[PDB]
RNA sequence: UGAUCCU
């Protein structure tokens, strides 16, 4: 069974169904789809995700975690929250939360120590709302993939000083950005930007 | 020994147990690697004649340019080390001090010499070969692998008669 | 005091008419605990020549060298062997200079310092000749004492010479040093021990020990008594702390080849045929005095505490266990372990030496001791100067 | 024929679970332990120069400071955590020492502030334009203390919450007050600076812009004695701990500690600097003061030595103005001329960490270590050491030529 | 001045009480940032007090 | 702690 439509795969071993990766759909399949270095997902640690809605992307970090790692799913909406609740229900690793990310102590007790977060979110405070989660519940040293639309946060200013302007409101915060993309012909004015939550070290 | 920490390595600024300035860049023996010779003291058997061909070479330089007995021996100290073949020119003197390493005479080695005329494959093999008994210069059948052996006489190795390796080529 | 756990091994006569020395060591080995009557051990081997003796500090390693071609280091209490080399030039000595893993040996010509597999370190231009090659780990130094009238000093932790010394007294006859001290005790020809610092070009006291040369000598743990003994069949009992022999034992039936100290005060004097150990004999009145025979039984006059006599061998050398009570005798053929009850000290502290020691704790405690190693100015006559 | 042996067991020596650690038999008879002073030694000589490996001071600044110059500092004695600095701009930037961040800033005064000094949190900013206004933090200019002095300073009190400003003429202020209560005046001059002692609270140090020095008593309203110095004085500290004596600052390159039974004697006088120390602050423990100079530089010492065993410097701060010790005898924070007020460790080796009992025993025994061998000369090269800069390297040379020259 | 934390849970909660306080002014610092991920150097903080689940 | 070099 497809979770949104998209076509998987099937090999035999003396059978494993792979699910593909639609990059249009998702703006960290995207990123994978561009090329990255170094990424914050794992095998075998746990990560949360702020900003999904449903399994459009969220699956597939549920699958990239695998058998070991746990996906804690961020998010606010009824309808597709649903969704990831009964498409939680066949996946071990997910776990999603209803709750608005502007207060995240308002579920500081249902996840302790996650080490790797991810956003993707619309909202114009993005820095804020992921720095009100980093400075609680992430490891030292754990990373962030940012996931920017600049066409939704800040329209009025240039392009690229909508990157350039939040990657100084991250370095405010012990957030120093590994690297840039933009992701430009999956989604035409994105942007996806690894760093590391830095904390100790950060000069 | 031990991947020593930051602040362990500056204490500890002098010490080390593997590469020693009397033990002189363990030089000896990546010769000692590359002609395999089976005990240490054969190379200080040719450093200590080496030193010895530059001491009478420094102090033959030593002397007046056109003094009639310094040209002549100097000529008779390079006929000699030219015949043994430690060096491959005679016509300048300027080998007997840079030329004359303990590689140098010791790639004048018998297996070195078996091993450049390709009857053996390696060099070891060739040392293999002489403890078997296989090897001959001229007339004698040669036990000792670390025979010094002249640039005149090299034309008289041969494999030794009846044996089972010459047979093999 | 009371934290000690351990307590020494006894040897008690329980009559006058049953004696104290007449046990041996097949009679001793009945009434020994099974994994300690088994730590004595016979290593007859016969081919090459006759063998040199030397424990580490701490009992882990044992290492051999025959006087034709063997040098072996085994790690003697279990059944592994890390070294086993067979030099066809003739050597004289070795020790462990740091771990099991360096060990140094002595030479026809040249010292060698060698990895417990059996590879070649260093070897050094210097060290022309080599008869006693000793080490104090509280400097890193390596000092050998050859047929040569110097006295070569060479830090393995740099790996460098320190300072050479040419003593005019010509070949050292004996040499040992001083683990309280880190002075070193030179014997020669003239009877003459001379204490030595790495600093000081002329010794630091000489001693006129005895007639005829030097057989050998041996010092305490406290550094109080060295034991040392002439070729005259002579032992001085020497107090280093005050420069006096506190007795002589005068006409040996044979000079004793070595002497050598236990911890507890265990005095090791081998005529060659012959290995006697007395019980207290470094103590300051003479009826603490090492005599071979007492008269009539008399409390006063002391007989020797324990005796062997070898067959078939003239012994070399011996060396206690440090902290076990057995010694080491290298016979012409081998090694045995002859079996004290009280010459190694039964509570070690684990934080000077480790009888029991992991290769991870190894390797903590070799830079524990890199870290707090000497500069060689610091060799004096007393330690608290 | 008792036979007896060591047995060590196999079994207490080495231990029956893998997980177990070993166990660890000691004997501490001399015998076994030769080297009680030269092993001993060479430990101290290992920290020393680790010490000297682990001189890392700098932390980081606070936030972005001043632009203008920092010329007073004041600190909540009860907040461990925030702290006030003033600009001679008129700016006041308020930190917290966690974030490292402005907590809150004011536009206080147009002219320049003297000094700024906490009582009821509450902040209180005196001017050069004859007036100090009273700041909260979580907004502003609660009210404004109007004086006929330009104000030279201010100091706080704690008791019947009391401020006193330093003026021409110091004049004795309460919160409720719009004018003062009571105006003094030893000798008829401008007075620098003022300090409250912060036990038996009553007491108060004033300098004297000509060369003065008066204990005032806020008891009789009236000062109790006065030694008229040699040369004029900068700033003032009260010891927390001793509660009766002081250090001030002075013109010249020397700061002088005094006792309030006798000024007649100093209690003791230090002159490592170069310039006119501008600043001094008195340890929690009472131990060591630190003070700031006119040159770019600022020294710790402690009080019974009288040199300096720890300076501190680096390029981009300069004629710091002010230097403020820590509630927690922890960190010094240091003003600037150039602004920006940098956190600096009181001793660069000792870290923030709260340390393993295994290293935390190891570390008290090796500074233990470290006085017991402390006037050995080898020791003495790396325990006196660090870098001094070129010019203050050359003007200590001129110091100790100009003192040859005058003996 | 940190002396009592709650930690919370599923399984009800957590009472800790802090021994020894870490320094709030180097709260950036690298000393006590490493010292965070040292459960040697974290255990000398808290100790357990109550979990009532 | 210190002391060299190049515009």
Redesign the interface.
């Known amino acids: 069974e497809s979770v949104y439509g998209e076509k998987r795969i099937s090999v035999e071993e003396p059978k494993v169904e792979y699910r593909v990766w639609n990059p249009f759909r998702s703006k960290l399949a995207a990123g994978i789809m561009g090329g990255l270095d170094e990424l914050f997902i794992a095998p075998g640690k746990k990560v949360l995700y702020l900003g999904a809605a449903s399994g459009t992307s969220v699956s597939h970090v549920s699958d990239v975690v695998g058998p070991e790692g746990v996906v804690y799913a961020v998010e606010f909406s009824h309808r597709p929250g649903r969704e990831l609740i009964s498409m939680a229900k066949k996946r071990p690793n997910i776990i999603p939360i209803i709750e608005d990310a502007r207060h995240p102590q308002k579920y500081r007790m249902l996840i302790g120590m996650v080490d790797c977060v991810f956003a993707d979110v619309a909202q114009p405070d993005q820095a804020r709302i992921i720095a009100l989660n980093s400075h609680m519940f992430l490891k030292d040293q754990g990373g962030v993939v940012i996931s920017i639309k600049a066409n939704c946060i800040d329209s009025t200013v240039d392009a690229e000083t909508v990157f350039a302007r939040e990657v100084q409101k991250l370095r405010e915060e012990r957030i120093k950005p590994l690297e840039q993309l933009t992701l430009e012909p999956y989604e035409r004015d994105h942007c996806i930007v690894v760093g590391r939550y830095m904390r100790s070290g950060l000069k | ?2 991947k ?1 920490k930051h ?2 390595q ?3 600024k ?5 590469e ?5 860049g363990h030089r000896d ?1 990546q010769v000692m690697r590359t002609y395999h010779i089976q ?3 054969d190379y200080h058997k040719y450093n200590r004649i080496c030193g010895d061909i530059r001491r009478l070479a420094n102090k033959l330089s030593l002397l007046p340019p056109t003094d009639p007995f310094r040209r002549k021996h100097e000529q008779l100290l390079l006929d000699k080390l030219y015949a043994m073949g430690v060096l491959t020119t005679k016509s300048k003197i300027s080998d007997l001090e840079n030329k004359v390493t303990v590689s140098a005479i010791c790639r004048r080695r018998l297996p070195v010499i078996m091993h450049r005329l390709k009857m053996a494959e390696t060099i070891q093999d060739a040392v293999k070969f002489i403890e078997q008994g296989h090897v001959r210069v001229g007339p004698n059948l040669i036990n000792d692998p670390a025979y010094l052996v002249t640039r005149n006489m090299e034309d008289y190795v041969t494999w030794v008669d009846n044996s089972k390796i010459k047979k093999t080529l | 005091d009371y934290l000690l756990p351990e307590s020494n091994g006894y040897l008690e006569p329980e009559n006058e008419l049953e004696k104290t020395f007449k046990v041996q060591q097949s009679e001793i080995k009945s009434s020994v605990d099974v994994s300690t009557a088994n730590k004595a051990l016979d290593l007859s081997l016969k081919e090459f020549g006759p063998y040199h003796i030397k424990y580490a500090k701490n009992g882990t390693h044992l290492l051999i060298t025959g006087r034709k071609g063997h040098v072996a280091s085994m790690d003697w209490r279990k059944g592994q062997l890390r070294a086993e080399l067979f030099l ?2 003739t050597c004289h000595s070795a020790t462990y200079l740091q771990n099991e ?2 060990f140094a040996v002595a030479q026809k010509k040249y010292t060698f310092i060698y990895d417990h597999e059996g590879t ?7 060290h022309i000749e080599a008869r006693h090659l000793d080490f104090l780990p509280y400097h890193y130094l390596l000092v050998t004492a050859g047929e040569t009238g110097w006295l070569k000093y060479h830090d ?6 320190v300072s050479e010394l040419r003593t005019k007294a010509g070949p050292t006859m004996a040499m040992a040093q001083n683990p309280w001290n880190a002075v070193m005790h030179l014997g020669h020809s003239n009877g003459t021990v001379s204490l030595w610092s790495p600093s000081m070009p002329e010794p630091l006291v000489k001693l006129l020990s005895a007639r005829g040369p030097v057989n050998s000598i041996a010092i305490d743990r406290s550094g109080y008594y060295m034991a040392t003994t002439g070729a005259d069949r002579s032992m001085k009992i020497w107090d280093i702390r005050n420069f006096k022999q506190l007795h002589s034992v005068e006409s040996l039936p044979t000079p004793g080849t070595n002497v050598s100290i236990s911890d507890t005060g265990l005095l090791a004097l081998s005529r060659g045929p012959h290995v006697t150990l007395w019980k207290d004999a470094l103590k300051l009145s003479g009826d603490s005095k090492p005599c071979f025979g007492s008269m009539g039984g008399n409390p006063h006059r002391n007989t020797p505490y324990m005796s062997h006599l070898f067959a078939g061998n003239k012994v070399e050398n011996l060396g206690f266990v440090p902290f076990e009570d057995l010694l080491g005798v290298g016979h012409q053929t081998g090694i045995t372990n002859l079996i004290v009850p009280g010459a190694g000290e039964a509570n070690y502290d684990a934080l000077e030496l480790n009888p029991f020691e992991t290769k991870k704790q190894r ?1 903590e405690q ?2 524990r001791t ?2 707090n190693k000497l500069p060689a100015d610091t060799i004096t006559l007393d330690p608290n100067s | 024929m008792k036979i007896k042996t060591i047995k060590r067991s196999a079994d207490d020596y080495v231990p029956v679970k893998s997980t177990q650690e070993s166990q660890m038999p000691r004997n501490l008879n001399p015998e076994l332990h030769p080297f009680e002073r030269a092993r001993e030694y060479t430990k101290a000589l ?1 920290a020393t ?2 010490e000297r ?1 682990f001189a890392k001071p700098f932390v980081g600044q606070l936030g972005y400071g001043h632009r203008d110059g920092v010329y007073a500092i004041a600190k909540n004695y009860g907040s461990l955590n925030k702290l006030a600095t003033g600009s001679a701009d008129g700016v006041i930037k308020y930190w917290n020492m966690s974030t490292r961040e402005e907590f809150v800033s004011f536009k206080a005064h147009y002219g320049l502030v003297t000094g700024l000094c906490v009582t009821q949190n509450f902040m209180l900013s005196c001017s050069d334009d004859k007036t100090v206004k009273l700041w909260s933090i979580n907004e502003g200019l609660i009210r404004t203390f109007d004086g006929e002095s330009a104000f030279q300073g201010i100091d706080s009190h704690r008791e019947n919450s009391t401020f006193a400003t330093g003026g021409a003429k110091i004049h004795l202020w309460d919160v409720n007050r719009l004018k003062p209560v009571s105006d003094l005046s030893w000798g008829a001059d401008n007075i620098t600076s003022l300090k409250f002692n912060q036990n038996e609270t009553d007491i108060l140090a004033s300098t004297g812009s000509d060369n003065s020095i008066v204990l005032y008593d806020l008891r009789t309203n009236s000062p109790t004695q006065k030694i008229v110095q040699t040369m004029r004085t900068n700033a003032i500290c009260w010891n927390p701990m001793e509660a009766f004596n002081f250090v001030t600052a002075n013109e010249d390159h020397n700061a002088y500690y005094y006792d309030m039974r006798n000024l007649s004697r100093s209690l003791n006088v230090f002159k490592d600097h170069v310039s006119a120390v501008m600043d001094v602050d008195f340890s929690p423990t009472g131990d060591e003061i630190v003070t700031g100079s006119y040159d770019k530089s600022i020294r710790i010492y402690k009080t019974n030595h009288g040199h300096s065993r720890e300076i501190y410097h680096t390029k981009r701060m300069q004629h710091v103005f002010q230097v403020k010790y820590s509630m927690d005898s922890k960190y010094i924070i240091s003003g600037s001329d150039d602004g920006n007020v940098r956190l600096w460790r009181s001793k660069a080796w000792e870290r923030s960490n709260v340390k393993t009992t295994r290293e935390k025993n190891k570390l008290e025994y090796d500074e233990k270590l470290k006085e017991r061998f402390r006037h050995m000369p080898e020791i003495k090269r790396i325990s006196r050491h660090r870098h001094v800069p070129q010019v203050i390297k050359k003007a200590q040379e001129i110091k100790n030529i100009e003192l040859s020259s005058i003996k | 001045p940190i002396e009592y934390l709650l930690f919370e849970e599923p399984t009800g909660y957590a009472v800790f009480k802090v021994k020894l306080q870490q320094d709030d002014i180097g709260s950036r610092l690298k000393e006590v940032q490493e010292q965070i991920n040292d459960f040697g150097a974290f255990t000398k903080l808290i100790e357990l007090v109550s979990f009532a689940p």
């Not at chain 2, 020693?20 to 002189?24: G, P, R």
């Not at chain 3, 393995?156 to 010479?161: D, E, F, N």
């Open positions: 020994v031990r020593l602040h362990e500056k204490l500890l002098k010490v080390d147990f593997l020693w300035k009397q033990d002189q023996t005990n240490r003291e | 066809n030039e893993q360096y070649e370190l260093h070897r050094l231009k210097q393995v932790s740099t790996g460098q010479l390797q070799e830079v890199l870290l | 290992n120069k680790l490996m």
